[PDB]
Design a protein around this ligand. Structure first.
Ligand SMILES: N#Cc1cc2c(Oc3ccccc3OCCC(=O)NCC(F)F)cccn2c1
Lengths: 546, 407
């Protein structure tokens, strides 16, 4: 229907067009089919064909959610056609729009059939209506529905069609998206309503129907699970179901709705709920709920009780993001230009790695935020951060990775971010020296831990249900319990030396947590490593004992 | 100018790499840059039946914006059959010259048309902010900078232009990696810098413009240093025995049996132990085997080079280039000097760039770096100090060292 220039299309190299056999179908529909083919051929969107080079594609039909509709399964032609540029995977985030007084939503109908199909490629869309026995032989002249090439071609066609209208009206802004156009303008309602009328008249000269103002939608706008309001945006109403049992499926659909709402409702927590999902089993088992999971969901219901809203972007104002701790390896942030209205909100969780500390998680949060600001606003924010310069200078000086830390100002809001202890970097003079070691049996899984100190002291503790890893941290925990506020531990295991020197303040293992509690209490600890089984003096003894 | 036909290795499709989100400022520079380039004919806009892509970045070469294209993937899918077909051979004498200046001859390529059927694989996208609009799509019509095929195809012209200068100066080494000429001499820095301006003028008066120094004389595997101390402790002999035990994986003729008896009973860490006759003998015998280079370490022209970098503190970073574990072909240490106007990512980025040049001079190929940095962090700021036109491969070693001081 459009005079648009076609886009040339090829078949995947060394392939050929789809040659499928039409299945006999119920004549009740066969005649219902031709009431479509003739009313489509009259508008030119298909055309009858002969027996020349016939490939074929199957075709079906079904009722309507009054008017039976046609279906063409291009699943085989789709496989053989060339590849195209990928249509827009993402969408704009409302935090990122800038308000435009009057906004108008136009959806073009028939959009794929308004756009023509490249001539030499039409012969591979051939399809056939059956009989009882001959057969009607058709083929497409416009972008067929559910063909692989239709979305990307139509998007490019539409883009080209707008281009002359934009060059005349640099005052107005059009967002394109699938079959919709969203037109915004800082024009007074009479100029704006006139320009919209110019646009629809332009598009109809290229064959593209648009709704009349009797059909022009009006705010609020329900778009991609949002509520678009003339001065504010929010998500759709969230509904958290109340069930006794919970399916593995059911838990997935809830952590879904919950993550969605965290864009704008601050405080959403989703740690314990997806800990339950760590089952990774198939999707009908009724997973039982934990008490912490039952508590978290309660708390989310209390945030979602009331409704909350977000502002739009203003390019003349600064961009500021804030981060507050929530204790469970869970962090939360709000992005705003004004202190009573957020642009958007969100959370971060270090569900990667078994041991971590707060400063490193804080840095990873700053990193998440910086990536997201770039996507949405084209810039990075200024950070309002609950940590102090001397704290951070110390960690990123002594860290092994390189880290990049933007300009930030310290907001004094508890809970702060601090270093909860520091290992000494040289041995402590006038402190005992524990020579810890530990060992376990891979079959029995019994093992043991002990130490020997320079003051002649000696212990050995038996363990059950352990591993050379568990018992090696168990040795170190032992030396800590039994010593002064200053202690010199000396160990032969690289694993245990690895965890400790990382300086974690939180962990999955309760053993490591108990070691952390002891290290916070101690006033000085020097940890030291020697090669195992190298007759160095000190280890040799423990190894025997243990 | 007729076009050299260009073919991928058969069964290889074109590249499809995701475009990275960019600052608004950078997008403006690309759109300016690309608008001029479309006018001079170098690149053209494309349609939706072109599925390929290649990332674009904007860097600062200066107070003007240069554009950098990451042709890494398209190089693997074409040039791997163009190290063989039109390959440029590598002189093993360049590492041995006293001075080596590097000249940028990237403009040459932009005159030469690119094979019409190959252009579709040069496609790139200028992204938009907040997915407002599918980006601007372009493809090249001329030999693109950063593609490894541009200097293969332009070789014949380059050999011709250079040869009148090669005759006058038969003792200068000229090597071409990508868009850069490496010129190495044995002249005094005063005379080297003269000869370079002669070549700059010869080049400029044959139509080849270039914008207006290394010393590979101390480039070897730096030896392992045993701390020399006047007095020793139980802790210092533990650090010493632990180091020498790790070196035994490199120099297998190391005996630590004498030093380990020197602290026989369980003794306090700070307890000072004097060393016996057989101790200093085990220390000095091991010092001489650790200042003398390794046996069995040969460059393999079929394996990749691998460069590992570790952060040392106070603006110091040490590096190791190898192809097999522990057979280090090269080691060094890089230190910045940018006061308090230096940060961790500025220093790592210059480290990578300096390591890649040494790699190019010595072997004619670049390593693949095992980088100590969060991946998303690097994918966000590396372009802020990238002054180079090539881009090495890298991955991110989220596993810590635990070694450090051993280097
Ligand atoms: N159904 C629907 C719908 C409408 C839009 C949309 O609106 C705009 C269109 C052009 C220019 C600016 C626009 O937003 C600026 C902020 C604003 O005020 N938006 C409209 C709200 F106040 F109604 C943008 C993106 C997706 N859309 C989906």
């Amino acid at each position: 229907i459009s005079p648009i220039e076609t886009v040339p299309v090829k078949l995947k190299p060394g392939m050929d067009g789809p040659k499928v056999k039409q299945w006999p179908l119920t004549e009740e529909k066969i005649k219902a089919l031709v009431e479509i083919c003739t009313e489509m051929e009259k508008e030119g969107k298909i055309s009858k064909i002969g027996p020349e080079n016939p490939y074929n594609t199957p075709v079906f039909a079904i009722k309507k959610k009054t008017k039976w509709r046609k279906l063409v399964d291009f699943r085989e032609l789709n496989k053989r056609t060339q590849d195209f540029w990928e249509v827009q995977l993402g969408i704009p985030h409302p935090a990122g729009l800038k308000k435009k007084k009057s906004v108008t939503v136009l959806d073009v109908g028939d959009a794929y059939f308004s756009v023509p199909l490249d001539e030499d490629f039409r012969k591979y869309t051939a399809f056939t209506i059956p009989s009882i026995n001959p057969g009607i032989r058709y083929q497409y002249n416009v972008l067929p529905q559910g063909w692989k090439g239709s979305p990307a071609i139509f998007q490019s066609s539409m883009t080209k069609i707008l281009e002359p209208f934009a060059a005349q009206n640099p005052d107005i802004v059009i967002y394109q998206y699938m079959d919709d156009l969203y037109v915004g303008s800082d024009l007074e309602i009479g100029q704006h309503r006139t320009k919209i009328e110019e646009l629809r008249q332009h598009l109809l000269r290229w064959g593209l129907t648009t709704p009349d103002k009797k059909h022009q939608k009006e705010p609020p706008f329900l778009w991609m699970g949002y509520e678009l309001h003339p001065d504010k945006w929010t998500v759709q109403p969230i509904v958290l179901p109340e069930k006794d049992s919970w399916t593995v499926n059911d838990i997935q659909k809830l952590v879904g709705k919950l993550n969605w709402a965290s864009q704008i409702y601050p405080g959403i927590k989703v740690r314990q709920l997806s800990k339950l999902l760590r089952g990774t089993k198939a999707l009908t088992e009724v997973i039982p709920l934990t008490e912490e999971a039952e508590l978290e969901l309660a708390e989310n219901r209390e945030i979602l009780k009331e409704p909350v809203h977000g502002v739009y972007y203003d390019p003349s104002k600064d961009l500021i993001a804030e981060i507050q701790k929530q204790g469970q390896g869970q962090w939360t942030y709000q992005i705003y230009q004004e202190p009573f209205k957020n642009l958007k909100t969100g959370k971060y969780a270090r569900m990667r790695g078994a041991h971590t500390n707060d400063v490193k998680q804080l840095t990873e949060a700053v990193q998440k935020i910086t990536t997201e600001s770039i996507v949405i606003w084209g810039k990075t924010p200024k950070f309002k951060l609950p940590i102090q310069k001397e704290t951070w200078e110390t960690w990123w000086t002594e860290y092994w990775q390189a880290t990049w830390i933007p300009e930030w100002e310290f907001v004094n809001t508890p809970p702060l971010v601090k270093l909860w202890y520091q290992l000494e970097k040289e041995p402590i003079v006038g402190a005992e020296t524990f020579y810890v070691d530990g060992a376990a049996n891979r079959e029995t899984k019994l093992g043991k831990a002990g130490y020997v100190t320079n003051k002649g002291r000696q212990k050995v503790v038996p363990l059950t249900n352990t591993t050379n890893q568990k018992t090696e941290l168990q040795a170190i925990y032992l030396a800590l319990q039994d010593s002064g506020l200053e202690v010199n531990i000396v160990t032969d295991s690289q694993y245990a030396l690895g965890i400790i020197q990382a300086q974690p303040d939180k962990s999955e293992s309760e053993l490591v947590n108990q070691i952390i509690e002891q290290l916070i209490k101690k006033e000085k600890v020097y940890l030291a490593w020697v090669p195992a089984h190298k007759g160095i003096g000190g280890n040799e003894q423990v190894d025997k004992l243990v | 100018i007729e076009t050299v036909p260009v073919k991928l290795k058969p069964g290889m499709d074109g590249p499809k790499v995701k475009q990275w989100p960019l600052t608004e400022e950078k997008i403006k520079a690309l759109v300016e840059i690309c608008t001029e380039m479309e006018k001079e004919g170098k690149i053209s806009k494309i349609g939706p039946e072109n599925p390929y892509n290649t990332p674009v970045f904007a860097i600062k070469k200066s107070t003007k914006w240069r554009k950098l294209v990451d042709f890494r993937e398209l190089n693997k899918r074409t040039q791997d059959f163009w190290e063989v077909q039109l390959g440029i051979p590598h002189p093993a004498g360049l590492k041995k010259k006293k001075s080596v200046t590097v000249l940028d001859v990237g403009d040459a390529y932009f005159s030469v048309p690119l094979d019409e059927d190959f252009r579709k694989y040069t496609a790139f996208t200028i992204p938009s902010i907040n997915n407002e609009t599918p980006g601007i799509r372009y493809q090249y019509n001329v030999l693109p900078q950063g593609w490894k095929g541009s200097p293969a195809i332009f070789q014949s012209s380059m050999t011709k232009i250079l040869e009148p200068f090669k005759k006058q100066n038969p003792d200068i080494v000229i090597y071409q990696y990508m868009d850069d000429l490496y010129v190495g001499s044995d002249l005094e820095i005063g005379q080297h810098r003269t000869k370079i301006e002669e070549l700059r003028q010869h080049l400029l008066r044959w139509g080849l413009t270039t914008p207006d120094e290394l010393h590979p004389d101390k480039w070897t595997v730096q030896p392992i240093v045993l701390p020399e101390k006047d007095s020793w402790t139980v802790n210092d002999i533990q650090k010493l025995v632990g180091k020498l035990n790790w070196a035994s994986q490199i120099y297998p003729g190391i005996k630590v049996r004498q030093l380990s008896k020197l602290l026989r009973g369980t003794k306090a860490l700070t307890e000072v132990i004097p060393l016996t006759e057989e101790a200093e003998l085990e220390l000095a015998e091991n010092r001489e085997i650790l200042k003398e280079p390794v046996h069995g370490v040969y460059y393999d022209p079929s394996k990749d080079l691998i460069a590992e970098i570790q952060k040392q503190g106070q603006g110091q970073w040490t590096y190791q280039i190898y192809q097999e574990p522990f057979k280090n072909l090269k080691t060094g240490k890089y230190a910045r000097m940018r006061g308090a106007h230096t940060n961790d990512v500025k220093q790592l980025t210059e480290a990578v760039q300096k390591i890649t040049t040494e790699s190019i001079v010595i072997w004619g190929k670049t390593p693949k770096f095992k980088l100590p940095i969060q991946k998303e962090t690097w994918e966000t700021w590396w372009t802020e100090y990238w002054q180079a036109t090539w881009i090495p491969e890298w991955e991110f070693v989220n596993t810590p060292p635990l070694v450090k001081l051993w280097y």
